[PDB]
Automatic annotation (TrEMBL), chain C:
Keywords: Mitochondrion, Ribonucleoprotein, Ribosomal protein, Transit peptide. It is found in: Mitochondrion. One of its GO terms (cellular component) is mitochondrial large ribosomal subunit. Residues 34-105 form the Ribosomal protein/NADH dehydrogenase domain. Belongs to the mitochondrion-specific ribosomal protein mL43 family. It comes from the Eukaryota. The chain holds residues 2 to 106 of 159 of the full protein. This is Large ribosomal subunit protein mL43. Coiled coil: none annotated. One of its GO terms (molecular function) is structural constituent of ribosome. It comes from Mus musculus.
Length: 120, 78, 105, 140, 42, 166, 55, 192, 64, 97
RNA sequence: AACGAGCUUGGUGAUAGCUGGUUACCCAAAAAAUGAAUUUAAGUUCAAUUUUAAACUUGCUAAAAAAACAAAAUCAAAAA
RNA sequence: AUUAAACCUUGUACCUUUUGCAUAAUGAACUAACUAGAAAACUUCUAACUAAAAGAAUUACAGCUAGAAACCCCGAAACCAAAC
């Protein structure tokens, strides 16, 4: 049992894949939302290390990571233990005023105005 | 020995989630060459913090007030 | 220890909150030594914190008894008739102040 | 005998008082009482966490009893109440069934109505107006 | 000095008030408790 | 040793008021260091429990055990002092409130065995205790009737509460 | 053998030694003994320094 | 014989604990115990209930006729004023107050019902429970302890009589509502 | 809820509809609870602060 | 266990008897007395351990040096055997080599 | 009244790489059984691991091309 | 837990030992008392004085002096000397 190298074809999407997941092959998203959803117990030690490097020690708690190849390379190692979701900014990036009023939704949207009131 | 219906359904769910992980990992924002050096400053100062703590170890100050305060144990109402 | 001990149900002394809230603690007794290392912290409680506690609680009668003593002790009596006793031996002002407030509530 | 332990009496009493309600020599003999007391302590700690799961099993059984009176299986009752944005928990639901039978009956009708709406919505494919009770109040 | 002024206020020095310099003495460990008993480090 | 049973006869109660039930007289008597097993004595002491003085003496007079004669003598000693010292008006007006056997101070000896081996013999002694109360024997216990049993069952049902809820 | 305000002496030493090191020196003040302890070897610079102050 | 004085001292405490269980002490009046000042206790009683009293009247309310007889008997071997007059006013006012409240709440209920409930709420059992737990028994002066129930009931309403004079009917009505009208909580009609 | 009607929030009712008022009557601590994960002394006693609240009024207004 | 049923007689310590009152006097006889006498000369005790300290093996050998030839036959036999017991322990037995 | 060599006392607390036992609380960290020599494999010493304190600076993962045999263990700039 | 002692639910005695497992296996009838880690070469910590320290004999290219800190109990078959 040794580390495996996945064929490059796995990470080359198909036209229907873009339709299903609703992601444009151009203007790719910038930030990942990564959550660990399985345990590192009974997994090889290299998988254990990458999980600690990425900060996913606690399960079901989301961490933000750069959508850059070096980060992606580690994520591919632990692809089976995590869920990757594209961070969305419906109302734009938070500013100094809106830093204290943010909330990350389950949908993947970081809203900058969080009122806890009926939409009305 | 057959495999339950719970067991086969739950794995397919996990496969579907992992299938999506494949897709989201196929669209890197920055190429490899563009990546070089974009975070050099933060990494440099971060280690300087590590070194500063490591080399700042030293004994603690000792004060007269601590030693002389033990005498208060025999304080009384005169 | 549940099967080895008694149990009761949630209750109030005389429907305390229905008409008017009444404070159950009704008496505090503090015995002290004028000169004893164990009672140093209790002595400071009398100097600084006893009067303010007495004013905040006008239904609690407070008795302070400086006397030749070996351990300072707090005795708390309630309207329903319960009596509770506390060793105050070698406790700081902060601990004795914290303990006294818990008894009142 | 320069130094001899002088508190052994109170050390023995500590273990014994936790054993007086046992039967046999376990209740009076320290060597046997000590082992019996520890097993009780281990059991007492572990039962603290099994208590919370046993009461939830009890609540579910009582809820299934109350819902089946009105003709609903437990899964349908719980699920369809949630889809109406009602966040009553299982402990509170049991209290309603036992002490508020008329209010619980209304919840059963409400959960049945939402279930009835769900069948029509899924059964009729395409764009059909959403059910009256299937409307979801959004928050922001 | 200011240190001597503190002595003026403080209670008398006596045999009942003595204390060693902090950390002057280590504490010796007997092989009695479970941590240091049993096989006793051997 | 401990010899409390003898002093139980020296309690002095204060004079009773005219409007109060007459207190029954109580007599405590014992025999110490009887060459007899306390276990064997238990059966004799047990048998006369609750019986009247004359009934107990009749049962003892025709028993073949050694302790039976010993218990009879104690009862006669107790009966006489009750009239003589405890102001009991009638000899027959007495019943055995308490009667029990206690261990005494024994001796250790050697019982020989076949192969140069031995065992620890015990020369057993016992105590005998009685308390005599003036008045007729209390009435015997009556078994619970069917209706008596049924009512308890219904009370058990009526005590029920809804468990683990408001 | 430092008498007076031992804390004042530290401030002066920190200013005196900082330019050479480029950072504030790590020190311990033992007020009971009356001694100032500095990390690293600075005896030569600190002996000439004291001579000029006249100690 | 093992060294030391402390172990013997600890076991002396145990011997005290056992003796009390086997031979429980006769209950004693709290006054006879240390840490007691009558004047301060009376003021705390008023302040406890968040009410203002005229201390002279309150002291009279606690006094009982039986107490005076005992003191005179000891004196034989200041006449003062008994709670009687205060007792009558307090009982009479309380009877009207309880009746008035029930009629407004339960207009239909027959006059026979109000008399029973009013008698129940002013009865020895109900007043005894309230009076004891408000410290009334501690402050009562009487010739016998524990205070007999009729004497305890008499003083409790005497306190209301003193309160009525000091702060008027409006405040006295609140006191009846707070401590007596609460005692019918959870009680079905035909139990009372 | 009442005898003849009830109001349900989604998931909470409006402030105007329902006003519930309580009082804090007692602040205490629980009885000593034993935690023992063996020995007889490898034991922790847990006491946690507690508060008792009396519920005084539930009021509704016609703002439906 | 069993415990005393009565308090033992009160123990009285008089803190100002001559021995307690004047304890410690003439302990600076050297520095305050021009060093004619060392304080160790003021110690009262066994001849072989005045102004000296050692472990049990060292104490056994030193007692033998000072009074070995004035000891009783039974005591010298026991003293000699104790030396050999302690010699074999300290030099052959223990955790640390 | 236990003779392949009597019994008693002393030497003597004989020695035992073997068996058993080795007495309060709490916090923390934590291996192995890989390698080497040994009348040595029921033991011990060293390496290796672990640990505590101290000094100061790069470490872990990953690591292209290119190399040493070859279609992943060594080695391994920049990065992240 | 319970309104309720028992019914309902959960739960493969302990120490050592195997191996980090036992339904192995050793030891324990129970009570009271008694019954097993001891040393300063080096290291660390706290002070005194300091090119010197130590109350003679010693160490020293910041050292030297003092304090504190450490390494178990029981058990053979045997061997030898002198008596009996
Ligand atoms: Mg669960
Ligand atoms: Mg023979
Ligand atoms: Mg036998
Ligand atoms: Mg040996
Ligand atoms: Mg070997
Ligand atoms: Mg290996
Ligand atoms: Mg070789
Ligand atoms: Mg060889
Ligand atoms: Mg690199
Ligand atoms: Mg075997
Ligand atoms: Mg030691
Ligand atoms: Mg040999």
């Amino acid at each position: 049992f040794t580390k495996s190298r996945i064929p490059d074809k796995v990470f080359q999407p198909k036209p229907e894949d873009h339709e299903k997941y609703g992601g444009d092959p151009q203007n790719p998203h910038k930030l990942h939302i990564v959550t660990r959803i399985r345990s590192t117990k009974r997994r090889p030690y290299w998988e254990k290390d990458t999980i600690k490097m990425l900060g996913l020690q606690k399960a079901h708690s989301p961490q933000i990571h750069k959508n850059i190849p070096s980060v992606n390379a580690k994520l591919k190692v632990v692809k089976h233990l995590i869920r990757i979701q594209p961070l969305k900014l419906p109302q734009g990036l938070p500013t100094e005023e809106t830093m204290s009023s943010t909330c990350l939704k389950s949908t993947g949207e970081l809203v900058v105005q969080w009122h806890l009131k009926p939409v009305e | 020995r057959t495999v339950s219906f719970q067991a086969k359904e739950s794995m397919i769910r996990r496969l579907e989630v992992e299938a999506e992980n494949h897709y989201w990992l196929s669209m890197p924002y920055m190429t490899a060459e563009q990546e070089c050096g974009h975070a050099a400053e933060r990494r440099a100062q971060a280690f300087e913090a590590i070194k500063a703590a490591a080399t700042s170890k030293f004994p603690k100050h000792r004060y007269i007030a601590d030693q002389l305060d033990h005498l208060n144990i025999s304080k009384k109402w005169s | 220890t549940g099967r080895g001990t008694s149990s009761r149900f949630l209750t109030s002394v005389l429907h305390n909150g229905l008409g008017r809230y009444v404070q159950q603690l009704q008496r505090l007794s503090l015995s002290l030594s004028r000169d004893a290392p164990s009672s140093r912290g209790a002595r400071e409680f009398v100097e600084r914190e006893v009067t303010d506690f007495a004013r905040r609680n006008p239904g609690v009668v407070v008795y302070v008894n400086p006397r030749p003593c070996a351990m300072p002790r707090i005795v708390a009596e309630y309207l329903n008739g319960a009596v509770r006793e506390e060793n105050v031996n070698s406790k700081s002002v902060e601990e004795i102040k914290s303990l006294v407030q818990k008894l009142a509530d | 005998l320069r130094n001899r332990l002088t508190d052994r009496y109170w050390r023995v009493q500590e273990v014994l008082k936790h054993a007086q309600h046992f039967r046999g020599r376990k209740n009076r003999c320290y060597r046997l009482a000590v082992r019996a007391v520890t097993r009780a302590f281990v059991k007492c700690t572990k039962a603290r966490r099994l208590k919370k799961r046993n009461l939830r099993t009890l609540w579910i059984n009582r809820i299934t009893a109350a819902s089946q009176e009105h003709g609903l299986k437990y899964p349908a009752f719980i699920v369809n109440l949630i889809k109406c944005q009602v966040e009553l928990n299982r402990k509170v639901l049991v209290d309603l069934a036992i002490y508020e039978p008329k209010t619980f009956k209304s919840l059963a009708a409400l959960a049945k109505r939402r279930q009835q709406e769900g069948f029509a919505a899924a059964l009729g494919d395409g764009k059909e107006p959403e059910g009256i009770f299937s409307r979801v109040v959004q928050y922001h | 000095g200011t240190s001597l002024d503190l002595l003026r206020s403080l209670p008398r020095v006596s045999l009942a008030n003595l204390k060693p310099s902090p950390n002057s003495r280590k504490r010796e460990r007997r092989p009695r408790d479970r941590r240091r008993g049993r096989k006793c480090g051997r | 040793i401990s010899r409390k049973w003898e002093k139980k006869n020296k309690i002095v109660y204060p004079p009773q008021l005219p409007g109060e039930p007459r207190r029954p007289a109580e007599i405590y008597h014992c025999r110490r260091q009887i060459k007899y097993s306390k276990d064997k004595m238990w059966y004799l002491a047990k048998m006369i429990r609750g019986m009247s003085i004359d009934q107990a003496l009749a049962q003892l007079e025709f028993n073949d055990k050694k302790g039976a004669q010993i218990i009879k003598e104690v009862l006669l000693e107790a009966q006489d002092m009750a009239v003589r010292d405890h102001n009991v008006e009638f000899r027959s007006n007495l019943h055995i409130a308490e009667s029990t056997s206690g261990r005494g101070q024994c001796l250790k000896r050697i019982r020989y065995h076949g192969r140069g081996r031995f065992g620890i013999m015990e020369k057993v002694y016992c105590h005998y205790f009685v308390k005599l109360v003036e008045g007729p024997p209390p009435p015997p216990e009556v078994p619970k009737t069917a209706v008596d049993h049924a009512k308890d069952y219904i009370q058990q049902l009526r005590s029920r509460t809804i468990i683990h809820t408001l | 053998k430092v008498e007076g305000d031992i804390w004042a002496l530290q401030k002066d030493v920190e200013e005196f030694l900082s330019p050479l090191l480029g950072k504030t020196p790590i020190t311990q003040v033992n007020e009971v003994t009356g001694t100032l302890r500095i990390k690293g070897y600075f005896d030569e610079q600190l002996k000439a320094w004291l001579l000029e102050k006249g100690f | 014989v093992k060294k030391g004085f402390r172990a013997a001292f600890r076991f002396q405490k145990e011997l005290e604990r056992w003796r009390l269980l086997r031979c429980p002490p006769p209950p004693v009046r709290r006054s006879e115990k240390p840490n007691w000042d009558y004047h301060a206790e009376v003021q705390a009683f008023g302040s406890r209930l968040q009410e203002t009293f005229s201390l002279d009247l309150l002291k009279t309310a606690f006094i009982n006729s039986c107490y005076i007889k005992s003191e005179e008997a000891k004196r034989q071997s200041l006449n003062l004023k008994d709670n009687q007059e205060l007792f009558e006013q307090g009982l009479s006012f309380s009877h009207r107050c309880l009746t008035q409240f029930l009629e407004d709440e339960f207009p239909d209920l027959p006059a026979e019902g109000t008399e029973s409930l009013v008698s129940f709420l002013t009865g020895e059992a109900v007043v005894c429970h309230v009076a004891r737990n408000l410290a009334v028994e501690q402050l009562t002066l009487s010739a016998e302890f524990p205070v007999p129930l009729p004497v305890l009931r008499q003083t409790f309403f005497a306190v209301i009589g003193a309160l009525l004079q000091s702060s008027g009917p409006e405040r006295a009505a609140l006191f009846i509502r707070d401590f007596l009208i609460t005692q019918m909580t959870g009680k079905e009609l035909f139990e009372m | 809820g009442a005898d003849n009607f009830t109001l349900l929030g989604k998931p909470l009712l409006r402030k105007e509809l329902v006003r519930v008022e309580a009082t804090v009557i007692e602040k205490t601590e629980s009885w000593p609870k034993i935690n023992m994960k063996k020995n007889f002394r490898k034991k922790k006693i847990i006491v946690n602060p507690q508060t008792i609240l009396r519920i005084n009024t539930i009021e509704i207004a016609p703002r439906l | 266990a069993f415990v005393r049923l009565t308090l033992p007689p009160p123990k009285v310590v008089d803190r100002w008897n001559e021995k307690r009152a004047l304890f410690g006097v003439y302990d600076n006889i050297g520095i305050l007395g021009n060093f004619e006498k060392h304080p160790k000369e003021l110690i009262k005790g066994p001849v072989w351990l005045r102004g000296w300290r050692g472990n049990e093996l060292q104490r056994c050998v030193r007692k033998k040096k000072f009074v070995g030839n004035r000891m009783f036959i039974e005591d010298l036999h026991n003293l000699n055997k104790r030396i050999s017991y302690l010699y074999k322990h300290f030099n052959r037995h223990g955790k640390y080599r």
